[PDB]
Structures are given as C-alpha cells and as structure tokens.
Write a new protein. Structure first.
Ligand SMILES: C[C@@H]1O[C@H](O)[C@@H](O)[C@H](O)[C@@H]1O
Ligand SMILES: C[C@@H]1O[C@H](O)[C@@H](O)[C@H](O)[C@@H]1O
Lengths: 310, 310
C-alpha cells in the first residue's frame, strides 16, 4: 500500500497538541530543549504513540468526576477530580501509556471550562459550568494515577460526585509563575516520579537541518504574551496515517511543500518514520508562505539525502 | 472511476460536525415534525461542501472578528457588538454564495463559550478572555450581514477594535426562554430576510425509513436538561469525502454497520448522495451498538433498494 498524506492545506489543518487551527509553519534551530511531546505522535505507518488519540475534541480534554474541594497554596478555589479514559471507561494505570490518552503534554496553566451534568434526576439532570485552570506542573497533577486538580474563580458551584468534563480553551497566563514551557512534560504520576511509556524524543540528525513545526497561537485568559504551541504533525495527519497504515519503505519520506495555485514547489522537507519533519533552514521563525500550500509525498529517500535549502 | 470509500474510524473515534463534541451514539427519531436542514456537516458523497460547512473541527460554531460597541442589557449582563470576518481572517464578503461565514452556528439557541482577545498593538500584546453567550435567535445575530452580538457576565473587560475569537463550549440554557431548537435555522441576515444558499433539507423518501443521526450531548452552563446535537455525518466523513471526491455512481450508497470483533453486520443503511443516512427503523432513541463498530461501504445501490429492518 502506497504511502500518502492528506491533501489538506495549512488553512485546513488543526494542531495535534491543542484544539487550535494551524496558523503557520515554524522553525527554531537553536532550541536547547529536548523535543518530546506526547500528543500528535504517530509513526508514518500509523502507530499512535505517547498520549495521542484520534479526536480533535480529546486533545487536552479530561473526563471524570469531582470528588471534593481541596486546599491549595495558590489563588482560587481548588477541586480534585478523578479522571477516566475519554470514552468513559476506567483508566487502567497498568496500560503502557504515559497517562490517559488526550492528557496535556506540556507544563503550564491550561485554561478552559469545567462542565457537569448530574447523574441523578421532567426527569432531567441539573447542570453547571465554570471557567477552570489546570496547572500541569502541580504536584496534584497526577493523571497517570487517575486524578487531577483544577482551580476555579467560582467559589462554590461545583458539585461532588458528578460527571465532569474539561473543555480546554487556552492558557491562564504565561507570566513567570505560570511555568509555561511547551517542551517540558508534566510529571504524569506526580512530583519526583519518572514518566513512562513515552513517545521518543525527535531531533534532526543531518547537518544544516532543523525541526519543522506546525504552529498555533494559543488564547490567553489574561496578561501579556503571544504564546504558541508547536506540533510535529497536524491532527489530520495523525488521523490519516492511523487509518492508512501504509508500510514505511525507508526511514525518510521526501515531501514537497507545493502551492496548488501555481503548482510550484516552495521548499522540500524530510518526513521521518517516527512522524516529524526536518528542513534545511538556517533561521528561526515562521515560514512565510500562502496558507493554501500543502505537503505532497514525492518519494521514499534515505538519511543521506540532501535537502534543497529553504 | 475512483472507488467510493468511508473512513474506517469507529464511533468512539468520530466527532460531531455541528458542534465540537465527540459522537456519543447513533440515534433515530421517526416522528420528528421539524424540517431537517442543518447547514454544518453538509457534504455530498462526491465531496462538495454545502451550507456553512468548513473542514476545521475548531471552526464549527466558531467566530472571528472585532468588538465595536458595548451595550448594556436592560435587565442583566452586557452585550457586545462584533463584526465578524471569515475564520481565516479575511473580510467576509456577503455577496459570496454562502448562507453566512463558514462555521456559523446552524441552530437556534443560546450558545455558550469563551470570547478571547489578543491585542494587535504594543513589546507583548495584552490579552483577555471571558465566558460569553451568543443568542442565535436574536435580531442582532446577523452573521450574513457581517455582524453579531454576544453577551458576557463580565461587565467591562472586553476591548473594542481588537482581534476576537469565540470558542464554543456548549449551551447557556435550554429553558423555554432560551429558545433551543437544533432544527430551527438562525435568520442569518435578520428576521425579515430570507436565508440564502442553503444546503437542502433531508428526509427519507421511502416509507418505513427514517433519518439516522450521529448524536452528541452538549454541555450546559446552568439549569436542567440533557441537550443533544444530531449531525448527518461526522466531521471526519466531511473531511474524507472532500479529499476523495470520488464520483457518485448512484443516488445511494449502501453501507453496513459492522462489528470488527466478529466481522458481522449489525444493520445496514442508505447513505444518500447529498450526504445523509436513512435506516429502516420504526422507533426512536439510541441505536444500541458497540462503539468500536463502523460503517463500511458495500455497494452503490438504487433509491428503490429495500433496507433490512433494524
Ligand atoms: C493584560 C491584561 O490582562 C488582564 O487579565 C485583562 O483582564 C486585561 O484586559 C489586560 O488584557
Ligand atoms: C549510503 C551512504 O552514501 C554516502 O555517500 C556514504 O558516504 C556513506 O558511507 C553511505 O555509503
């Protein structure tokens, strides 16, 4: 079965690490951090890795039940919630995943909405929703143990023992104390514990090459900043690769970024077996190109192939 | 002739095309008196997008634009006038042959979500976000005219002339005065004006058949209720069909809902050319079936094909 990519343009793609549209292509050659995100991880022959699952609605989502309001040193009203798998089944910590699929894969204060639909009940359940923040760096962020903590501005109107959904919206803050670092993984089982079953780190191996990211700008609840989330492949590529399961005929696919209005190749890239892109670029920042561009699979090459400079 | 295919995503791997929600169940309602003419999640089998349908899961019921004016409500809450652009940021052209900007909500109700802003000017821009409600039945909901109104509990902290995003989360209410009706279209240009360029209504033509929906339950900000949103096809089908653009070889594709664990067919359905499903079922409610089940295209049939009763 021949390898293929979706023919979706950049303006028709969404981020695999946060529910956002892809805004720009982006490089940062001098990135010192180890790049090892856990969402949007999929091999070219369709093997999902890390915490990656298929739903755009599942990315950085949680499902579970509030247990109790809890004390926390930090501002706001805090709540413990047990988390299940996103499909409602119990999370089994013995499964070989880092955390429930969909769990956020970066450090920061993730802003969103907690909503509840009560179990009990014209035989219709009571509901409530409020803004909420999940600090993924918190010692109480233990999704691998089956529970996390969120904070609200709302002081009271959150119910214990009721089905609870977290819908992510953005970040609460990117100030110094909010610890936003998109390449720092949460400690999924809590402070001082080793993460396990991780998707592997990614890096360029060839000289002059750097990672190419699909970048989205993420909303902020307040403060100054223009934060972004970089994913290795968009969610639609994850969905496509997963379904096709085409054999990878080498370690590296040659892809061309093409303008379909002109038919011209804007640049070429290496699409690696583990599911990430590299380019021959010597600068950091956005790739300035029309958002009607798309990557076209041209052929299987090898690690020794030299890319045309961008 | 390029063969017609459906994605091999299971029910637990599909998302709603009319609101950013996972698919929860398949659902019928034979006695539905309303005309079914939703405008999101509309796509022909040969890949023609219709109504307000666009490809991004993040675009469904989303808005982008700028706030122009604050108006206080006579009783409670603050209202904000917003000019809307296309989701890709370009000016919305009301002379284009669409009902409204793509992604525009296609039902009557109070849609609850978060309005977020990132200022243009500054050396980092200021941000804010607040819970917001868009009443799509309001005389002020005129997205086809390039402007809508949203309300906030927040009384002051929304900025004029700054890039504004609406992230949908659920419904504010489903009480009588909140006018939720998933099959009542908004008046995209206001009450006395006719909606234009609509995707056509859908219905079974043969007796004993009824529409089959992909149903998702939608969160509530408050009050009692268990509201749901029914779409004709999941967003992943829209994306798939759009890319494949396989010729339709008849008016009806016969599809089988199959259990991959046993390989057995649970039921069959008609997938109609205009992009909707019917089944031979004489009852209302969910279809009790495993969520690892999926629809498999078997053959092109004819409108007179008699479905096996469910
Ligand atoms: C930078 C400031 O952050 C705050 O949270 C906001 O409420 C203000 O409007 C402003 O954007
Ligand atoms: C396949 C590779 O071709 C390169 O040119 C050589 O330098 C390597 O040793 C290797 O043989």
């Amino acid at each position: 079965k021949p390898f293929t990519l979706p023919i979706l343009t950049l303006g028709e793609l969404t981020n695999s690490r946060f529910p956002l549209p892809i805004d720009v292509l982006y490089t940062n050659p001098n990135e010192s951090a180890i790049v090892q995100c856990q969402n949007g991880r999929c091999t070219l022959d369709g093997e999902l890795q890390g915490t990656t699952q298929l739903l755009p609605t599942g990315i950085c989502a949680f499902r579970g039940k509030v247990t109790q309001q809890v004390q926390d040193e930090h501002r706001g009203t805090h709540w413990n919630m047990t988390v299940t798998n996103l499909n409602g089944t119990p999370f089994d910590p013995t499964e070989d995943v880092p955390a429930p699929l969909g769990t956020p894969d970066f450090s920061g204060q993730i802003y969103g909405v907690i909503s509840q639909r009560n179990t009990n009940t014209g035989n219709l359940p009571a509901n409530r929703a409020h803004e909420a923040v999940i600090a993924t760096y918190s010692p109480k962020f233990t999704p691998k143990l089956g529970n996390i903590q969120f904070s609200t501005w709302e002081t009271q109107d959150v119910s214990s023992g009721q089905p609870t959904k977290f819908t992510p919206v953005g970040l609460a803050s990117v100030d110094a104390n909010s610890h936003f670092d998109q390449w720092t993984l949460p400690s999924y089982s809590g402070a001082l514990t080793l993460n396990m079953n991780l998707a592997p780190s990614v890096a360029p191996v060839f000289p002059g090459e750097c990672l190419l990211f699909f970048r989205s700008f993420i909303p902020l609840k307040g403060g100054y900043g223009n934060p972004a989330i970089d994913c290795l492949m968009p969610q639609e590529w994850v969905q496509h690769l997963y379904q096709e399961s085409a054999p990878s005929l080498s370690d590296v696919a040659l892809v061309r970024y093409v303008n379909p209005e002109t038919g011209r190749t804007l640049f070429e890239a290496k699409l690696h077996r583990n599911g990430f892109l590299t380019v021959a670029r010597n600068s950091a920042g956005p790739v300035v190109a029309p958002t009607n561009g798309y990557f076209r699979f041209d052929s299987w090459v090898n690690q020794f192939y030299t890319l045309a400079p961008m």
